[PDB]
Scaffold this active site. Structure first.
Site, PDB file in Angstrom:
ATOM      1  N   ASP A  24     -64.946 -36.503 -30.438  1.00 61.21           N
ATOM      2  CA  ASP A  24     -64.720 -35.365 -30.895  1.00 61.21           C
ATOM      3  C   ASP A  24     -64.735 -35.192 -32.301  1.00 61.21           C
ATOM      4  O   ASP A  24     -63.736 -34.699 -33.343  1.00 61.21           O
ATOM      5  CB  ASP A  24     -63.273 -34.973 -30.729  1.00 61.21           C
ATOM      6  CG  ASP A  24     -62.777 -33.514 -30.594  1.00 61.21           C
ATOM      7  OD1 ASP A  24     -63.933 -32.748 -30.624  1.00 61.21           O
ATOM      8  OD2 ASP A  24     -61.859 -33.187 -31.044  1.00 61.21           O
TER       9      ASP A  24
ATOM     10  N   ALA B 234     -51.935 -25.842 -35.721  1.00 58.10           N
ATOM     11  CA  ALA B 234     -51.608 -25.741 -34.261  1.00 58.10           C
ATOM     12  C   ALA B 234     -53.001 -26.138 -33.504  1.00 58.10           C
ATOM     13  O   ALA B 234     -54.160 -25.694 -33.944  1.00 58.10           O
ATOM     14  CB  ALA B 234     -50.957 -24.554 -33.987  1.00 58.10           C
ATOM     15  N   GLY B 235     -52.929 -26.087 -32.410  1.00 55.06           N
ATOM     16  CA  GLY B 235     -54.277 -26.438 -31.463  1.00 55.06           C
ATOM     17  C   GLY B 235     -54.305 -25.956 -30.091  1.00 55.06           C
ATOM     18  O   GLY B 235     -52.888 -25.626 -29.786  1.00 55.06           O
TER      19      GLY B 235
ATOM     20  N   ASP C  22     -58.223 -36.745 -19.858  1.00 54.01           N
ATOM     21  CA  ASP C  22     -58.196 -35.997 -18.496  1.00 54.01           C
ATOM     22  C   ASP C  22     -56.789 -35.425 -18.275  1.00 54.01           C
ATOM     23  O   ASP C  22     -56.842 -34.276 -17.940  1.00 54.01           O
ATOM     24  CB  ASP C  22     -58.481 -37.103 -17.193  1.00 54.01           C
ATOM     25  CG  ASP C  22     -58.714 -38.450 -17.764  1.00 54.01           C
ATOM     26  OD1 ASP C  22     -59.644 -38.809 -18.331  1.00 54.01           O
ATOM     27  OD2 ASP C  22     -57.903 -39.423 -17.045  1.00 54.01           O
TER      28      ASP C  22
ATOM     29  N   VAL D 133     -58.920 -42.684 -27.507  1.00 53.38           N
ATOM     30  CA  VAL D 133     -58.545 -43.950 -27.305  1.00 53.38           C
ATOM     31  C   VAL D 133     -57.905 -44.150 -25.919  1.00 53.38           C
ATOM     32  O   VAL D 133     -57.969 -44.991 -25.230  1.00 53.38           O
ATOM     33  CB  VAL D 133     -57.555 -44.428 -28.604  1.00 53.38           C
ATOM     34  CG1 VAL D 133     -56.262 -43.842 -28.384  1.00 53.38           C
ATOM     35  CG2 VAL D 133     -57.376 -45.863 -28.339  1.00 53.38           C
TER      36      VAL D 133
HETATM   37  N1  LIG Z   1     -52.344 -36.884 -39.832  1.00 57.38           N
HETATM   38  C1  LIG Z   1     -52.637 -35.353 -40.417  1.00 57.38           C
HETATM   39  N2  LIG Z   1     -52.402 -35.253 -41.616  1.00 57.38           N
HETATM   40  C2  LIG Z   1     -52.359 -33.878 -41.890  1.00 57.38           C
HETATM   41  N3  LIG Z   1     -52.629 -32.742 -41.241  1.00 57.38           N
HETATM   42  C3  LIG Z   1     -53.120 -33.231 -39.971  1.00 57.38           C
HETATM   43  C4  LIG Z   1     -52.736 -34.525 -39.511  1.00 57.38           C
HETATM   44  N4  LIG Z   1     -53.134 -34.288 -38.274  1.00 57.38           N
HETATM   45  C5  LIG Z   1     -53.394 -33.238 -37.924  1.00 57.38           C
HETATM   46  N5  LIG Z   1     -53.436 -32.439 -39.008  1.00 57.38           N
HETATM   47  C6  LIG Z   1     -53.473 -30.695 -38.878  1.00 57.38           C
HETATM   48  O1  LIG Z   1     -53.139 -30.051 -37.528  1.00 57.38           O
HETATM   49  C7  LIG Z   1     -54.353 -29.111 -37.290  1.00 57.38           C
HETATM   50  C8  LIG Z   1     -54.319 -28.991 -36.205  1.00 57.38           C
HETATM   51  O2  LIG Z   1     -54.345 -30.190 -35.525  1.00 57.38           O
HETATM   52  P1  LIG Z   1     -54.928 -30.471 -33.730  1.00 57.38           P
HETATM   53  O3  LIG Z   1     -53.972 -30.001 -33.098  1.00 57.38           O
HETATM   54  O4  LIG Z   1     -55.537 -31.912 -33.514  1.00 57.38           O
HETATM   55  O5  LIG Z   1     -56.155 -29.096 -33.767  1.00 57.38           O
HETATM   56  P2  LIG Z   1     -57.429 -29.307 -34.333  1.00 57.38           P
HETATM   57  O6  LIG Z   1     -57.553 -30.843 -34.601  1.00 57.38           O
HETATM   58  O7  LIG Z   1     -58.319 -28.687 -32.909  1.00 57.38           O
HETATM   59  O8  LIG Z   1     -57.185 -28.377 -35.479  1.00 57.38           O
HETATM   60  C9  LIG Z   1     -55.573 -29.793 -37.967  1.00 57.38           C
HETATM   61  O9  LIG Z   1     -56.504 -28.771 -38.517  1.00 57.38           O
HETATM   62  C10 LIG Z   1     -54.919 -30.358 -39.323  1.00 57.38           C
HETATM   63  O10 LIG Z   1     -55.014 -29.653 -40.530  1.00 57.38           O
HETATM   64  O1  LIG Z   2     -55.038 -35.716 -30.003  1.00 57.97           O
HETATM   65  C1  LIG Z   2     -56.085 -35.600 -29.621  1.00 57.97           C
HETATM   66  N1  LIG Z   2     -57.081 -34.740 -29.626  1.00 57.97           N
HETATM   67  O2  LIG Z   2     -56.910 -33.219 -30.051  1.00 57.97           O
HETATM   68  C2  LIG Z   2     -55.565 -32.790 -29.571  1.00 57.97           C
HETATM   69  C3  LIG Z   2     -55.234 -31.373 -29.533  1.00 57.97           C
HETATM   70  O3  LIG Z   2     -56.069 -30.521 -30.409  1.00 57.97           O
HETATM   71  C4  LIG Z   2     -53.890 -31.147 -30.010  1.00 57.97           C
HETATM   72  O4  LIG Z   2     -53.758 -29.751 -30.515  1.00 57.97           O
HETATM   73  C5  LIG Z   2     -56.545 -36.610 -28.909  1.00 57.97           C
HETATM   74  C6  LIG Z   2     -57.364 -36.792 -27.796  1.00 57.97           C
HETATM   75  C7  LIG Z   2     -57.808 -38.018 -26.983  1.00 57.97           C
HETATM   76  C8  LIG Z   2     -57.200 -39.081 -27.549  1.00 57.97           C
HETATM   77  F1  LIG Z   2     -57.436 -40.466 -26.682  1.00 57.97           F
HETATM   78  C9  LIG Z   2     -56.131 -39.097 -28.589  1.00 57.97           C
HETATM   79  F2  LIG Z   2     -55.674 -40.301 -28.689  1.00 57.97           F
HETATM   80  C10 LIG Z   2     -55.763 -37.963 -29.215  1.00 57.97           C
HETATM   81  N2  LIG Z   2     -54.985 -38.197 -30.470  1.00 57.97           N
HETATM   82  C11 LIG Z   2     -55.195 -38.965 -31.422  1.00 57.97           C
HETATM   83  C12 LIG Z   2     -56.085 -39.907 -31.695  1.00 57.97           C
HETATM   84  C13 LIG Z   2     -56.053 -40.864 -32.651  1.00 57.97           C
HETATM   85  C14 LIG Z   2     -55.170 -40.776 -33.608  1.00 57.97           C
HETATM   86  I1  LIG Z   2     -55.009 -42.221 -35.246  1.00 57.97           I
HETATM   87  C15 LIG Z   2     -54.307 -39.866 -33.528  1.00 57.97           C
HETATM   88  C16 LIG Z   2     -54.251 -39.057 -32.402  1.00 57.97           C
HETATM   89  F3  LIG Z   2     -53.297 -38.116 -32.464  1.00 57.97           F
END
Ligand SMILES: Nc1ncnc2c1ncn2[C@@H]1O[C@H](COP(=O)(O)OP(=O)(O)O)[C@@H](O)[C@H]1O
Ligand SMILES: O=C(NOC[C@H](O)CO)c1ccc(F)c(F)c1Nc1ccc(I)cc1F
Ligand SMILES: [Ca+2]
Ligand SMILES: [Mg+2]
Ligand code: NA
Length: 314
Positions: A152, A38-39, A179, A173
């Site tokens: 990030d 979760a995020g 925003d 991207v």
């Molecule tokens: N493509 C993926 N495959 C496996 N785990 C993933 C993938 N993308 C995201 N996660 C898991 O989701 C968790 C939280 O995702 P995210 O919402 O982006 O919050 P953060 O990135 O701030 O932890 C990540 O710490 C990661 O373990």
């Molecule tokens: O998802 C993004 N940031 O973290 C999100 C939160 O932590 C949700 O908990 C994010 C931010 C800007 C952007 F342009 C994106 F495309 C995002 N997502 C994102 C980017 C590349 C791939 I391959 C897969 C993806 F999913």
């Protein structure tokens, strides 16, 4: 330096060929299989796209904006169908549904370095050698082929897999998703460079700062600021602060360093060059690609996959 070897081009053909078969993605073709994380803005699931039988990661960004709005994010996200590299997490597509944007991507079975670290306590330098190479190339890829800066870099955004692969995800991207999100939703700025926290100018040098910061963390087994007071170190290798108090530290105090005597001098110099506060002096991608630590690390044939399975029980 962005050339693929034979084992990489094959994996890339494989992926595309699997993707080719995925029609339009819809809510109902998915079935939760587990929650990956979760995020502060969304959740992520290991899911099975029923038709194709494909496992994916489903990111559900429960942010609310009119269909009018959310259709621009989905638009710029389509750019992800163009991001094909061994250092970038594969993309399947993005759609809106239930007041939440879904981004479906390749599933990384080793998880994020975030979790690899918690499991391992600390990551050996030779391993971080490959992580360094992979991030550097991932960011060199994104800049060269899409004029994108990641924006990030942090341990939770570097994902690994049982095939010994290291890829980046969550890069900026879509400026509109930036925003439309980075508004009523914060996501830790604790790996942001001094210049971005000061509001000042910012390039991929900011991403280099975050990578360096992350590497020190992974190397020592702890988020490095403020510095581990000497006796904190004997317990470490033999041998609190509120958010705002911390970000101020970053901007006002000297950058973090690796404890000496423990790591090689090439690796200390590498992180020192990433952690240089003035962006103009901090190294850049081209320079890092030929740093002694990177050249030594490349010629090294480290079994990332072996080390990984052994450490997380994979
Ligand atoms: N493509 C993926 N495959 C496996 N785990 C993933 C993938 N993308 C995201 N996660 C898991 O989701 C968790 C939280 O995702 P995210 O919402 O982006 O919050 P953060 O990135 O701030 O932890 C990540 O710490 C990661 O373990
Ligand atoms: O998802 C993004 N940031 O973290 C999100 C939160 O932590 C949700 O908990 C994010 C931010 C800007 C952007 F342009 C994106 F495309 C995002 N997502 C994102 C980017 C590349 C791939 I391959 C897969 C993806 F999913
Ligand atoms: Ca539905
Ligand atoms: Mg993430
Ligand atoms: Na649903």
């Amino acid at each position: 330096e962005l050339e693929l070897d034979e084992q990489q081009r094959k994996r890339l053909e494989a992926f595309l060929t699997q993707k080719q078969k995925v029609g339009e993605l819809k809510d109902d073709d998915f079935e939760k299989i587990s929650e990956l994380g979760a995020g502060n803005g969304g959740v992520v699931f290991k899911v099975s796209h029923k038709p194709s039988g494909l496992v994916m990661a489903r990111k559900l960004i429960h942010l609310e904006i009119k269909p009018a709005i959310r259709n621009q994010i989905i638009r710029e996200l389509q750019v992800l169908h163009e991001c094909n590299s061994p250092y970038i997490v594969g993309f399947y597509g993005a759609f809106y549904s239930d007041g939440e944007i879904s981004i479906c991507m390749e599933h990384m079975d080793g998880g994020s370095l975030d979790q690899v670290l918690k499991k391992a306590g600390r990551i050996p330098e030779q391993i971080l050698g490959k992580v360094s190479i992979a991030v550097i190339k991932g960011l060199t890829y994104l800049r060269e082929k899409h004029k994108i800066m990641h924006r990030d870099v942090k341990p939770s955004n570097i994902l690994v897999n049982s095939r010994g692969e290291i890829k980046l995800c969550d890069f900026g991207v879509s400026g509109q998703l930036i925003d439309s999100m980075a508004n009523s939703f914060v996501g830790t700025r604790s790996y942001m460079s001094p210049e971005r926290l000061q509001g000042t100018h910012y390039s991929v040098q900011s991403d280099i700062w975050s990578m360096g910061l992350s590497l020190v963390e992974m190397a020592v087994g702890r988020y490095p600021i403020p510095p581990p007071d000497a006796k904190e170190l004997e317990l470490m290798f033999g041998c609190p602060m509120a958010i705002f108090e911390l970000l101020d530290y970053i901007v006002n105090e000297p950058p973090p360093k690796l404890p000496s005597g423990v790591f090689s001098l090439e690796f200390q110099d590498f992180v020192n060059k990433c952690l240089i506060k003035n962006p103009a002096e901090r190294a850049d991608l081209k320079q890092l690609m030929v740093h002694a630590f990177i050249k030594r690390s490349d010629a090294e044939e480290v079994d990332f996959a072996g080390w990984l399975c052994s450490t997380i029980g994979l």
